[PDB]
Amino acid sequence: MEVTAKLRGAAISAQKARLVADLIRGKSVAHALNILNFSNKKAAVLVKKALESAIANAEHNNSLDVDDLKVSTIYVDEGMSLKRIMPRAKGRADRITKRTCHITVKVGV
């Protein structure tokens, strides 16, 4: 029923990517692509890459037409975060966490 596509290691936090992922949930593939092409967010290119991968998989493996496809489900999961040390004033040090997220997109119909 659902053709899936996963993108792991997006080098961006999940909180910043969910804002973009909420825009295309439930729309058609053409409308979603048009929305993602003319946006200025950073996670937009990653979501667009994942959506194009899902559509290509649906076309090749399952042999589904592209005009009937729509964004059925989409979500973002947390990933491994890198830990670094930042020197503060008066000899103190803080811990910085570079966050990463995975994107999952399933197109249906």
């Binding site: 973009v20 909420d22 048009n34 929305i35 003319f38 967010k41």
Partner: protein, 55 residues
């Protein structure tokens, strides 16, 4: 100043409930027949019957 207690996830989501994004104004061009931002020049160089970067 710093908080005296934790902030529950309910209040956090209630505050974040105003962080929704919005779509842009995209229209179909009359000449090229391609989707483009309204009042903006198409990526190929065409706008309002005129063509920039003549090739």
């Amino acid at each position: 100043a710093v908080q005296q207690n934790r902030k529950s996830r309910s209040r956090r989501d209630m505050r974040r409930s105003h962080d929704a994004l919005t779509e842009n104004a995209l229209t179909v061009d009359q000449a090229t027949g391609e989707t483009h931002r309204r009042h903006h020049v198409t990526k190929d160089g065409f706008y309002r019957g005129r063509q920039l970067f003549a090739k």
